[PDB]
Write a structure and sequence with these properties.
Elements lengths: L3 H12 L4 H4 L8 H15 L1
Helix pairs in contact: 1-3
Length: 47
């Protein structure tokens, strides 16, 4: 496990992504693969 989760959280917070469900999606995604998939999903959805 790498801190890709925390780095993703920081990136999304900087992006302005605000939602308590995305920070459940925090405790849910625990592997880098999920973190990347979810981050990229949120990025695409916000774009």
């Amino acid at each position: 496990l790498k801190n890709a989760k925390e780095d993703a959280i920081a990136e999304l917070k900087k992006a302005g992504i605000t939602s308590d469900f995305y920070x459940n999606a925090x405790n849910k995604a625990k592997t880098v693969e999920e973190v990347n998939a979810l981050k990229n999903e949120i990025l695409k959805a916000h774009a």
